[PDB]
Amino acid sequence: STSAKRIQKELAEITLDPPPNCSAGPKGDNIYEWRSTILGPPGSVYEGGVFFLDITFSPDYPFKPPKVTFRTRIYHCNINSQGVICLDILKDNWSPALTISKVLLSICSLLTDCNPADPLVGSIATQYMTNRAEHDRMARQWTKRYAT
């Protein structure tokens, strides 16, 4: 189908050229259900953390973005306690020109540079801007606590 063929193509692509600090692929024979491992970007507050994400592709992929959620609890203004990720390209800015590699690169980028002006957890966004020192202390603590 349009969908399985696209997924198989994107799987070959990502296996050959994975994003830095990231891997991703099917959980089993069902090619629509992937898992990903992302390492906290070196130099970031998440460094040393190992984060797991679930990825579910639609039967209408690539016309609907993949559903991507953090399984691993993380302290981040764009990622909530249910692992929902506030990322334009996962919602209104998706297009069929994008790929699961580009999504995962953008999420890696998001861990490096959060978007506090477009927050999912406003309290954390406010903290990032007014008391960065403390935000970063907490992000580090949660990384060690939950992602190690």
Cβ neighbours of 133 (radius 10 Å): 8
Distance of CA 28 to the CA centre of its chain: 20
The answer to whether 22 is a known catalytic residue is no
Complete domains list, the chain, with CATH: 1-148 (3.10.110.10)
The residue annotated as part of the active site, out of 22, 77, 86, 108, is 86
Resolution limit in angstroms?
1.9
Q: Report CA-CA distances (Å) from 76 to 9, 109, 124.
A: 32, 13, 7
CA distance 3 to 65: 12
Determination method here? X-ray
